[model samples]
Target chain A: MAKRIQFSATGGPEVLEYVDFEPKDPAAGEVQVENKAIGINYIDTYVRSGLYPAPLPSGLGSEAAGVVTKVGTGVSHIKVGDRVVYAQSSLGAYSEYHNVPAQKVAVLPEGISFEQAAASFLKGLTVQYLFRQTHKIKAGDIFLFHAAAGGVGLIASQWAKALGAKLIGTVGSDEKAALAKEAGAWATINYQTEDIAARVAELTQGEKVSVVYDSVGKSTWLASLDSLKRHGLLVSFGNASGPVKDVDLGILNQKGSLFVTRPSLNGYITTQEELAAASEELFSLIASDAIKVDVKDAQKFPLSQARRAHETLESRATTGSSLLIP
Target chain B: MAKRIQFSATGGPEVLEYVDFEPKDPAAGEVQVENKAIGINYIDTYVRSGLYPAPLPSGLGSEAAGVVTKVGTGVSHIKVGDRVVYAQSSLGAYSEYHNVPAQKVAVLPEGISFEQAAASFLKGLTVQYLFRQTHKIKAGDIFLFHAAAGGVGLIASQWAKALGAKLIGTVGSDEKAALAKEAGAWATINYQTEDIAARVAELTQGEKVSVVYDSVGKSTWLASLDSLKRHGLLVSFGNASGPVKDVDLGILNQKGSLFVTRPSLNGYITTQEELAAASEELFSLIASDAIKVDVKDAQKFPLSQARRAHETLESRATTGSSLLIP
Candidate 1:
């Protein structure tokens, strides 16, 4: 029997229920993996709350790292008994075993453990696309990033610094500010206390940031616009606070003729070549010790304790990368 | 006394009344030019009909070419009796004489006539920024240009072809299609009769255009989004039809992760150095005969006939550029 977390209704974390199903063999071009760790993201909360919908009684979670136990016909690149990780897929990660298309899975590097693989795959690959492809932060360029202590933020801040960019990050509190700074943010502003645009202006000597990576929608949208320099880019990828509203395109021209783009990981890593390029950069960064994956606050729970794990994450009590050890 | 045409009220060309005013000497960093020809544009119709507000009873035109009669204090590069032209601003071009800020004026090349200079200054400069600065079309790149028989389109189609670009233009009729092709369009689609997206797809062999220069707003907005390749740019500078509606950010992702920008001439050519760079390229094209100005279609109306000229332009009865023979 394979145990998994399932949700039938949109509500609080309590709606998640654990159930068992008979194990099945992998279909053509599919690989079955025994899950060791699952990545918990804020987007998961949205899916559970119906802010972003999934089918009823759907399996929860989007990414996991595990050991491949079976390979179906025509699956040649990845062999059985290989360790792997995947991102950007329909939910099923919160399970003891799950089947995934072989093309979506990548073998984990030797030095990267299953827990670290699960924790970093989604966020790290996301940062890879943000830094390398979207906008392309050049050396000596200054940029603003929101939610600098969050999963994607932490990884992106370090990556931006490694690329020789001056990174300015915004955090909810002073404690998170410290974490952001340790993650290679040259400066951190507490959104709860400071005016984000004013601080960015002062830090960059009245020259606005070249790009702004905003995940904290609504709350940061306006300030992010004001913080951009002429021809700067605004990359909005997530909506943590709430979805942005009443956006005026004229504001883009008024704000130094800036450019704005809303992107997602699926749009970037769509093809096999794109997936390989993104994942290769991420794994190289991990192997080079340029970026560290800290799963320090991870709490192990039985498959049945999925609801409690969700509660901890939602309450903002967990720091670093939190995961489920199924 | 200098003769000038002024609007008594926002109405037709009949509203323009010729008036005499004391011509003042040029101020610091200014020059007085004896007008030879004035450029007429669609925007003049907007101002005439009160669609775009102006100072009440204001000067009638925005662009002109003439000979500098006097250079004000602190102006050294241009001296008395220098041929010059300018675009934008309320220079009161529909006059026997007018004072213009030296910084906004460009010296006309000897190879280009005052009539050609007057006709092409504004529209030519606009195309300069659209192709060179805003999106920067390169050799062999494919692009869609709306209003392909209009003033800017005629000049841009030729200029884009000169740059070795594959120019695909949209016209309102088959006659306009022939005009666009003569102006250098590789392919012309009658947008009023044909489906723009489907035709663009077929024209490019299912590979979408690299960029779409859209000034025909509202009606072309949805099709413009559909006609772009992955990462293609949509440049919206004018609202000829109507302003575009509220847009969802997700639409950018849905359209192959495209990029859209609403740019203005004022934003890109702010500095005098930028103005000179932009104008130099435009003048070089004219001097080299790479972009031929169709001055024959330019109907010269007396300064007092501004209202009648506005009606002709608004009714779309006039083709190519128009001028006020002051």
Candidate 2:
């Protein structure tokens, strides 16, 4: 029997039920990916906890790095035996094998491990859109990237430095603050100990930052508004802390006539060409050691230990990216 | 004695007590301007009718054109004999002779008359910030420019074409629709009679506009939000209907992760360098006959007839820009 992780209801780590399920054949336009390594994100837990609703007995992941096992008829792009990794795709990444639409599967390139691809692809592509399209990060520009010591933050710092831009990171603890400083951050703010907006104001000497990469939603929403220079862009990309439900649009006017976007991974890249381009650029960034993926920081578990994998992640015991090996 | 319009309380046109108040000498950095033609905008009416509040006994307008008659010490930007126009300044544009700080005024360009400057300067600069800086219109883009026959709309129609973008404008009446079309819109929609979102869908063949330049606030807020492609911008710059108070930020995410900004003229062009650059570009556009500002379309009256001008504008009897000759 094929092994997979599924939940009959939304609860905690205990609700994650591993079962022997039959793996289905690839349908039209479907590419079957055989498990190699699967990257786990905080959003998966939110899905598991039901903050994000899904059908009952939900499959448990949005990203994974693997090799394509089979390609159905009508799938011309991704052939069988090609290495691939997927993110911002349909659920079911926590299994021995999974089927994904050929359009969302990006080809994994050379000099990158399945672990590294699993660790950084979704997040790397996210930074790609933010820096490239969302607001072009110029060489002399400054960025205040919130949640700076987390998975996405580690990669963004290296990328920002390589592009000649400076990144000031904010963290929840002294450990993350110091940890984030080593990962290409020019400065670090410990949100637990210091006031974020005050530190940002004093650091830039009132010049303020050009772009604010915010994922710690709700609480930091107002701080993000107060932190930008005149005519700056606020990229609200994630909701790790919580979602921002209500916002006074007039405050956008009062706070230097700012521009705001609540962008997601799916919104940035839709067509095959766009996905390919963004992914390829990211792959090169990984291959050239321009972005050295810190896989040692990732906590790994076997496919059967999905419950413990999540429990560890939710308890915040892990250091960096988390993954499941199959 | 100097003639001017001022009101002690917020009320109707009758509250505009026209009186001859004694003029004072120009203070340091203050340049005295003898008014030639003053621009009357819908904002002037809003300020008059108390929709936009101010200190008790508020001045009447925000834009004007005149010849500088005196320059105080420390005023190096303008001399005693240069023609000038100003926008997004401290209110007091309705007087015969007024003192303004040198930083807020732009030296009027040649071949552009006082009436033309009075009529289109603020609106032109507004379009400058919207199309040039806020989003920066590129070629082949389709835009939904709301209030297409109004002050800003008339200028934007010509500017959008000059920048090689297509404009689908919305007007309140058929006459205004034709007027906007002549101003260089690709197509005009009567928002009163037609479904704006449906028309936009049909016009662009299922792909919505790249940007929606909305000035009809409160009423067309949702329609403006709907009339955009994925990742399109909604530029909310006015409040003809009412101000948008509480906004559900989730709607931005639900609408394909869109972007929205409420920009004001004062928000953009805050420096002498910025103001001069924007004003020069606008002056060149008008001087080259590219934007032919017709003072004839503007209902002109003496500065003393402020009440009648406000009445005519509120009744929507005026077709194009409005001005008061001093």
Candidate 3:
């Protein structure tokens, strides 16, 4: 028998229940993993609160890092007892043991800790796409990134700096601003107190940025548009504040002929080859110390305390990455 | 004194009236040109018909090539008797002689005719930015182009072929399809009689294209989205039918994580350096015969026939480039 956290209904954190489940063998081209740590993301809250619905009695968590317990028939690259990590796959990671498709599992590089893998896989992979694939941040290219101290921002700031880009980040408070700066952001704006558009222009010497990575949505959409340079790219990846309302494509042309994209991890990592390529880029950065993944701020609660972890993330009390210890 | 077409009121093509007026001397950074040819565009109709309002009684046309008759005190690169062409800055291209800012005018390359210069200046520069700067079309890349027999599409299709890209185009009829194919489009679809999405899929072997350039707007928006591969760009530069309706940002994510942009030539050619670079590349292509500028379809009407020319363009009877002879 294995243990996991399951939600019976869509509501507050209290709806999540820790329960026992039967251990299942891996299907063909699948691998069974014994999780050491599981990642907790904002999307998990949306799924739990019915903003983004999942099937009832579903296991929580979408990413994790662990040791492989068994490899199904026809699986070639992975073996039993291999250390692996994965993100952007089907759910059921918040458990003692779960079966995942073999292609989703990546053999963790030497020197990367299990907790670090659990904390940075999804966020780092996202940063990889944003910085390298989407717009290809070049030197002297300035851009805005909302939620600058959150899971993705923390890793992205450091990565952008390594690529010789001037990263301007936006956060909710002074402390978060400082954290963003420490993570390699050239400038940090506390959205609650600062005028994002004015401050960005002032920082960039009256020139607007080449791109704006806006996940805060709705509340920040207008300001994000204001900060972009003529022909800039606007990447909207989430609706953390609230969903943007009544977007008009004409505004894109009126606002200096900007380009806009709303991307998701699933579409980016669809094929096994794409997944491997993304993971390789992310892990190489982790191995080279070009991007630092900090897992110390994460609070590890037992499987029974999964509900408390959700509350902490929702309450905005969690500063950096957070994970659940199985 | 100069002779030009002007509109005192916004209405149909009949509003365009030819009249004589005193020529204004060149200002501090402007040059007066003896206009030989004026480029006619669909946008000129918009300005004349009140769809895009400008000052009433304004001179018509926005592009032309001519002989520089006088240079402002500060102008250095160009002098009197130099042949030149310009598209942006201000509108006064309809007259036999008009003043233009020195920064907007580029010295014409040797062997390029004044009529060819007038015909290709705006549309050719537009294609230069779309292929070279905006998305940077690479060899072997496949992409979609709407209204393939239109001015910009004809030039861009030939340019893309020269760059070793496979251009796929959509047209209104089999005649236009043949024109597009002759201009170097590897595949052509008649949107009126064919399913654009299915044809694009079949043509690309189900691996959707890298980008889609849509000028048809509303009618082609959904099919354009369907034609793009994951992370493909949808470049909307015009709305010949009507403006695209309001869009949900989430749809971009749902539709293969597409990137969308509404670009304008004015935005891309804002800087003097960028203008020079774009013109240089375009002229090099013209000089090499890699891209041909055919003004044969430009029905030479007297300046007084401006109204009839606009009607011809609006009715979709004109093909290739058009110019008004002074």
Candidate 4:
């Protein structure tokens, strides 16, 4: 038996109801686990608030950390009681029990807690794809990343700097800007008070960044496009404000033969081998202290307080990674 | 004294006048050369017909081969009696005498005749940018190139095949198709009778080409884009038919995050070294007989007969390279 949060209809975060459900045996290529912590992202609010529609009576979460209670047949990676965490092709990580495809699961590294893994998995892998896989953040390469105080943005700020790439990170407020600056962004732009692309052009001295890691979507689409040099890559990975629309292709040519890619994390980590590569690179970097992710006690909340946490994130009060403990 | 085709106003081929103009001295860094051969491209018709607007009374021709009669004060690389060919910066190459910047001129090698240099300069440099600079067409890579029998296309077909890249060329007629096939195009599509993208998709088994060289913009923009693989480059170099309009940017993302570049020959050959390297490669290939360019007497007409040549090219009846002998 396990307790999970789900919704019968799309509405506010208040509509999420914790309900009782029975666990099934781990089927082939599956891992049934007892969750220790679950990951919550800003995108979750979009589905809950009906900005992005989902089917009726659906599970409410997609990432979690847990102990493998049972391993499915044909799986040999882990046995009962192994610590694990997953972020793709699995749903309802909000529950006490989660059945995840074994291939999507990674063995939890030493010195990382269940809550830390849950808080950083989605964010870490995001920056992984944006900086490493999407466009290699090489030395002397300058880039613009939107939403500096967000989970992925903060980690990316540090990692890209460590790789010798300069970052101009954008945030909504002075305090958030300071936080972003502390997190290793070379410079922070309070977009609400400053012009993002204009600042980027000045900072790079008219030679714009080599790439723009834009997750801000509609509000920052034009800035992202304008903030790149000739043949620069525009990595539009998320839509924090709203989805982009009516983008004219001619602008790319006019903007100096630019490249744009809307890539998904799943698209980059489609196979077990790919998952291993991205995850190992992320973990090794963290272990080597090349990059650090802040997943601390202040950002944690009990599973029942999920709605309360969303309110803080929605209001831009939260600055670092957040998690929900089971 | 110089005899040249200068346009007072944009209109039909009748607008071209073979008028005599007073000769100018070799200015600083300029070379006064007696033109032996002049290259006339299809782009000339666009400027002549007012499709691509140009300055009023501008000289019509751009590429020419000549022997230097005098050198400017600052000139160092070229001297008097040097057989040089130039395609950029110095317009009005239709004249018997041209004063071009010495930096823009490449000394013609012994084996390549003056007429060969004139006929192939613009077209050869175009493929130099498309194949080497835009996207390096590696061995075993497939690409789509429109306008198979035209000057640039025929030269590209041979050069790319020599580099071990297979090109699927599109032509308007079966005659053009056979001509393209003979020029080393791995396959030829009669766009008038065949579905361009469909044939390409079938030929590559949905893997599609690595790059699409789209010079036929209006008629083949959509087809060129649809024929590329994931992360493929779309090189939109010319608008032979007409300009592309109402192009939505989302298609680049929808079509597997492909890249688009409207590269120019000037953009690629910006420096003296770049000009030397590009021309040397093009000339060496011709010298080795790896790529054959047709610049025979049949393709040559007196510089005074410019209007008749324009009439033939306007109806698309002209095939192979055409040059004006001075």
Cα lDDT, all candidates: 0.85, 0.86, 0.87, 0.82
Clashing pairs in 3: none
The per-residue C-alpha lDDT of model 3 at residue B234 equals 94
Ranking by DockQ: 2, 3, 1, 4
Clashing pairs in 4: none
Tens digits of lDDT, candidate 1, A1-326: 97999888999998998999876899997899999989888888888999877889888887999999999998989999999998865688889898988889989989999899888999998898888888888988889999888878788778877888878988888889899888888899999899999999999889888799998888898899999988788888888778876666677878877777777888788876788888999999889987888876456555678899889877765556778888
Estimate the TM-score for candidate 4. Answer: 0.89
Q: Candidate 3 lDDT, tens digit per residue, A1-326?
A: 88999888999999998899997899997999999988888988899899997998787788999999998998998999999987855668889898889987788987888899999998888888888887798886688999889999999898888888889999888888898899899899989889999999899888899899998888899999999988888899999988876876778888898999998878677767887888888888889988888765447777779998988888886677888999
lDDT minimum window of 10 residues, candidate 3 chain B: B295-304
Off by over 4 Å in 2: A296-298, B49-53, B296-298
Show the lowest summed lDDT stretch of 10 residues, model 3 chain A: A294-303
Clashes of 2: 0
The regions of model 4 sitting more than 4 angstroms off are A7-27, A46-53, A218-222, A241-250, A296-298, B8-20, B45-53, B90-98, B218-222, B244-248, B295-318, B324-326
TM-scores for all predictions: 0.95, 0.95, 0.94, 0.89
Task: Report the lDDT of model 3 for residue A62.
Answer: 80
The interface RMSD values of the models, given in order, are 1.7, 1.3, 1.2, 3.2
**lDDT per residue (tens digit) for residues A1-326 in model 2:** 68889999999999999988888999897899997999888888999999999998888887898889989888998888998998866788998899988988898876788889889988888889998988889997888999888889888888888788889898878888777777778888887888777888899998998789999888899888888988788889888778887676778889989989899888888888888999998988888787878765448888799999999988865656888998
lDDT, candidate 4, equals 0.82
Sequence-dependent TM-score of model 1: 0.95
Model 2 per-residue lDDT at B298? 45
